[PDB]
């Protein structure tokens, strides 16, 4: 499994034995993501939410017949201290799953 | 359709069959929604646990980079072996196949377990806890989405 | 032609007080008499049952039996799609209740049953449901009749 | 013969009657009496009875009836979401509509023909009930605009004052209506 | 005329005959003869012939016949779900009933009048075939409770032994029946 | 009005010894002759076929073709409900058999096919199914004739 | 009466006539005149007139006519899939067919009898429109095989040339046709 995030945390993610790439911009992120998925063996890909919140639709052309790469949006280092409420993210999940936008 | 009495009776039977199938499908949809709204809560809990782990892992990484230095941390990072593409074993939800990831990685078999640095190995432990936390979120979220398209199909 | 819109069934329904309908599906499965409880109706029931002319718990027991069988026959259909494990516990109780009902209550064979024996069997069948699920029946009769096992009729199905 | 409305008799009757009170057994199964369908019935004497209505009953009555009609209509547009998602999971702005329409169905539409005082209702009694229900809905929406939970609204003591309005005597009603109006005015803007 | 079963003569014949064998055009189209519509046929002499069957064929023949009828009824009931959600959406224990019903329909009910051996069938041959099918159904339902997937159950070679028991001669059937029963016993015990 | 229950076709079918029924759906697709094999019938087929008359395998091949085409037509209604991507491979085999049948066996144009050519084409079409699916054909004829591919005939 | 094509007058007429132009009320509702239903209509004079078409219009006219007939048939086939599944669930190799079918339906088959120019159309103008539509289809298929998204093709400005083509007068058409033909190839080569 590989992750894509800022270059500051790439060394930390390689510290745990994982595969780590650094990125600094959105189009860099999408190009890197398609180069990531065009080869196999990479079951899980983590993409920071500050640069690409919705990764499975940015690159959907290359896996629509193959559900092997599990893409995942993760919170960055800045959000880890400045805080973020998961309720909005879960409401968005309710949106692109069933779409009635009704939840408390 | 040729107009006969027998054909009229057959069509009247088919109307009842469709009207009963509608209610049966509605019951199936309710049964699916019941599990969906139970799974979403566990997804939320997993996400907040992941955030909590990320906070301490990133704090440890920042503190280790600031005080020990960047080059020593980079060398310790190159001193680790990579993990392989651990198995995505199959799993059945409501008659559909989904992958399930495995958290088993060779802990302790990673090279250089102890030595000179002090703040880097704690950051390594925090980051491997973070990696352990991430796959749980992945495994729950994929099942959540897969229940989602089943709801869509039944509707 | 099993056509309830035919003139002979239609004109009879304008003059008579309800009907008893025999079911072919119950007949093919070996159940005799194949009387289907769901489309059957008696329009003068309320003036014949009650205290002073039969046992006082007749009406609510009949309503509860009808309402429980209606749920059982649909849960049995849902089982074939979603499997037995996906149901809750009480749905499984209803699923077993429908089968026990069809096996014992309807399939009496050539036996002669008094009203007291039929009510005993009805209360024994309702006993397999948990107390408090019987919404239609008042507490006074529930405390008086609930709890008997079905092993009495099991000696002669 | 089988509930079909395409029979010649019903078609010929529909062409000439001024009112059409359709019954249905779906509400009789719930013991909801009278069991008429309020989305299938219609009346043609409404537009001609309005000058009598606004003189003999109250000035706002023809304008007030449309409020009850629209409130009952708005839940018929919410029936496509309630069978999918449970009622408790709805947003409060829709939970309010569901609950007020429910209390409308269970206090104003239903009537006990066997009761001593519920079997007959004069017109001012019904008018007071609709006025009081609109007061409840308007103040509840105003409180909801202030970000409060709807659970505290459902526990308000005025809700039982809503249920008890049916069984008051015809002579005894006006004081009860004034007291209910005072209580419902005190409840909602005492709550922050 | 036009296959219309509501004809005056057909309805007149319905009320005075002890048996009624209704033919279907749909089964005749796909060359599945004798094309008897099992759903709309009946016989009133079934209950009176039991003492003869218990004497001349076997002591438990009516039980096997009732089991076959019950299985056919169960297969007919589940076909309303297949046309709704497709055959693969069903559970394994119901796919077993569907496949056993299809086995009965293609093996026991079908008969060829122009074949050398299949044109005539004595009672004991039919009894053996029914016993064989019911034994296979019992073993198959035993296999499901042991966790065996149904996708491999139908691949067993004993189905072709069942599938061609029609064409075995009457003087060869007594050995074939005992061979096939032993094969049925062996295959499912070696299965899991 | 293409009505088979009209009095004239009804009495003609009751009197005559079979019928050849054309299909408008096949004619719309450009198939000539648009003969529909399922409603058609020939009562005197059994007299003029068999060993010493045409060939020994004619009668069983005809029945097997009838059953396979019926199964393909049956699958054609289920795909309209759930789609071809949810089908098993066995049902796709029957679907492609029906599609190849309508395009290569019925559709022949103005050419004059002999009986041997027709039987060769029929055996070339039955070979697209597994050998265990041919329940109506004796194993001797299968061991003698089964095996050819369709592309071996054309040019 | 009531658009019933099974009435005696219609059925007596169809046995004698050589052509049958069937109208449809659904096409007339959406103002798709002349509202000829192209699925139920037929003509028996097509085969005899081919030698005349080959030398008075063009040597490849029947080929173009057949090529458009297959496109209409394929569009009608996909019209069984799209309406209940969704137009975006299809692959682009079928969305292209859907869009080309829409272009054919709106720009070629449709004709305004009350317009100044569109009321009359010579054979060569129809042949030119047919050629343009088929060339656009082939180029779009090649661009799809190059891996381009369909939306950049539907937004291509050259589509407006085809839509306005039938309003071009008979005088201007031989010059309009060449420019449109050059523009189609230029736009599909300039595309990515």
PDB file of N, CA, C and O in Angstrom, chain F residues 1-2 24 27-30 80-81 84, chain G residues 6 11 39-42 73 80-81 84:
ATOM      1  N   UNK F   1     -54.400  -9.309 -38.444  1.00  0.00           N
ATOM      2  CA  UNK F   1     -53.790  -8.647 -37.285  1.00  0.00           C
ATOM      3  C   UNK F   1     -52.808  -9.633 -36.622  1.00  0.00           C
ATOM      4  O   UNK F   1     -52.583  -9.637 -35.411  1.00  0.00           O
ATOM      5  N   UNK F   2     -52.229 -10.513 -37.445  1.00  0.00           N
ATOM      6  CA  UNK F   2     -51.294 -11.558 -37.013  1.00  0.00           C
ATOM      7  C   UNK F   2     -51.847 -12.393 -35.859  1.00  0.00           C
ATOM      8  O   UNK F   2     -51.095 -12.824 -34.982  1.00  0.00           O
ATOM      9  N   UNK F  24     -42.965 -11.796 -37.953  1.00  0.00           N
ATOM     10  CA  UNK F  24     -42.697 -10.427 -38.378  1.00  0.00           C
ATOM     11  C   UNK F  24     -41.426  -9.880 -37.747  1.00  0.00           C
ATOM     12  O   UNK F  24     -40.722  -9.078 -38.374  1.00  0.00           O
ATOM     13  N   UNK F  27     -38.567 -10.970 -39.797  1.00  0.00           N
ATOM     14  CA  UNK F  27     -38.555 -10.266 -41.073  1.00  0.00           C
ATOM     15  C   UNK F  27     -38.064  -8.835 -40.911  1.00  0.00           C
ATOM     16  O   UNK F  27     -37.479  -8.262 -41.838  1.00  0.00           O
ATOM     17  N   UNK F  28     -38.303  -8.237 -39.743  1.00  0.00           N
ATOM     18  CA  UNK F  28     -37.850  -6.871 -39.503  1.00  0.00           C
ATOM     19  C   UNK F  28     -36.328  -6.796 -39.453  1.00  0.00           C
ATOM     20  O   UNK F  28     -35.736  -5.775 -39.822  1.00  0.00           O
ATOM     21  N   UNK F  29     -35.679  -7.870 -39.010  1.00  0.00           N
ATOM     22  CA  UNK F  29     -34.226  -7.893 -38.901  1.00  0.00           C
ATOM     23  C   UNK F  29     -33.536  -8.254 -40.208  1.00  0.00           C
ATOM     24  O   UNK F  29     -32.303  -8.279 -40.244  1.00  0.00           O
ATOM     25  N   UNK F  30     -34.285  -8.531 -41.271  1.00  0.00           N
ATOM     26  CA  UNK F  30     -33.679  -8.848 -42.547  1.00  0.00           C
ATOM     27  C   UNK F  30     -33.445 -10.316 -42.804  1.00  0.00           C
ATOM     28  O   UNK F  30     -32.727 -10.661 -43.747  1.00  0.00           O
ATOM     29  N   UNK F  80     -33.503  -9.030 -20.247  1.00  0.00           N
ATOM     30  CA  UNK F  80     -34.244  -7.775 -20.268  1.00  0.00           C
ATOM     31  C   UNK F  80     -34.644  -7.311 -18.874  1.00  0.00           C
ATOM     32  O   UNK F  80     -35.077  -6.164 -18.717  1.00  0.00           O
ATOM     33  N   UNK F  81     -34.514  -8.167 -17.866  1.00  0.00           N
ATOM     34  CA  UNK F  81     -34.802  -7.796 -16.489  1.00  0.00           C
ATOM     35  C   UNK F  81     -33.536  -7.438 -15.725  1.00  0.00           C
ATOM     36  O   UNK F  81     -33.468  -6.377 -15.104  1.00  0.00           O
ATOM     37  N   UNK F  84     -27.165  -8.560 -19.071  1.00  0.00           N
ATOM     38  CA  UNK F  84     -26.304  -9.680 -19.432  1.00  0.00           C
ATOM     39  C   UNK F  84     -25.089  -9.810 -18.525  1.00  0.00           C
ATOM     40  O   UNK F  84     -24.519 -10.903 -18.430  1.00  0.00           O
TER      41      UNK F  84
ATOM     42  N   UNK G   6     -56.830  -2.717 -35.600  1.00  0.00           N
ATOM     43  CA  UNK G   6     -57.440  -4.017 -35.840  1.00  0.00           C
ATOM     44  C   UNK G   6     -58.869  -3.924 -36.354  1.00  0.00           C
ATOM     45  O   UNK G   6     -59.530  -4.961 -36.473  1.00  0.00           O
ATOM     46  N   UNK G  11     -57.896  -3.533 -41.689  1.00  0.00           N
ATOM     47  CA  UNK G  11     -57.411  -4.866 -42.032  1.00  0.00           C
ATOM     48  C   UNK G  11     -57.791  -5.263 -43.451  1.00  0.00           C
ATOM     49  O   UNK G  11     -57.051  -6.011 -44.098  1.00  0.00           O
ATOM     50  N   UNK G  39     -41.093   2.124 -37.396  1.00  0.00           N
ATOM     51  CA  UNK G  39     -41.002   0.730 -36.986  1.00  0.00           C
ATOM     52  C   UNK G  39     -42.143  -0.120 -37.522  1.00  0.00           C
ATOM     53  O   UNK G  39     -41.943  -1.309 -37.795  1.00  0.00           O
ATOM     54  N   UNK G  40     -43.333   0.454 -37.680  1.00  0.00           N
ATOM     55  CA  UNK G  40     -44.481  -0.305 -38.134  1.00  0.00           C
ATOM     56  C   UNK G  40     -44.794  -0.151 -39.608  1.00  0.00           C
ATOM     57  O   UNK G  40     -45.612  -0.898 -40.151  1.00  0.00           O
ATOM     58  N   UNK G  41     -44.159   0.812 -40.265  1.00  0.00           N
ATOM     59  CA  UNK G  41     -44.418   1.054 -41.673  1.00  0.00           C
ATOM     60  C   UNK G  41     -43.575   0.128 -42.544  1.00  0.00           C
ATOM     61  O   UNK G  41     -42.549  -0.407 -42.119  1.00  0.00           O
ATOM     62  N   UNK G  42     -44.024  -0.056 -43.784  1.00  0.00           N
ATOM     63  CA  UNK G  42     -43.298  -0.883 -44.737  1.00  0.00           C
ATOM     64  C   UNK G  42     -43.674  -0.465 -46.150  1.00  0.00           C
ATOM     65  O   UNK G  42     -44.706   0.169 -46.377  1.00  0.00           O
ATOM     66  N   UNK G  73     -32.382   0.867 -36.414  1.00  0.00           N
ATOM     67  CA  UNK G  73     -32.700  -0.384 -35.729  1.00  0.00           C
ATOM     68  C   UNK G  73     -31.898  -0.541 -34.440  1.00  0.00           C
ATOM     69  O   UNK G  73     -32.439  -0.965 -33.413  1.00  0.00           O
ATOM     70  N   UNK G  80     -34.719  -0.111 -25.528  1.00  0.00           N
ATOM     71  CA  UNK G  80     -35.231  -1.022 -24.509  1.00  0.00           C
ATOM     72  C   UNK G  80     -34.369  -0.995 -23.252  1.00  0.00           C
ATOM     73  O   UNK G  80     -34.853  -1.314 -22.160  1.00  0.00           O
ATOM     74  N   UNK G  81     -33.109  -0.585 -23.374  1.00  0.00           N
ATOM     75  CA  UNK G  81     -32.202  -0.615 -22.231  1.00  0.00           C
ATOM     76  C   UNK G  81     -32.217   0.717 -21.490  1.00  0.00           C
ATOM     77  O   UNK G  81     -32.271   0.756 -20.255  1.00  0.00           O
ATOM     78  N   UNK G  84     -34.937   2.638 -18.413  1.00  0.00           N
ATOM     79  CA  UNK G  84     -35.035   2.225 -17.017  1.00  0.00           C
ATOM     80  C   UNK G  84     -33.692   2.008 -16.340  1.00  0.00           C
ATOM     81  O   UNK G  84     -33.666   1.875 -15.112  1.00  0.00           O
TER      82      UNK G  84
END
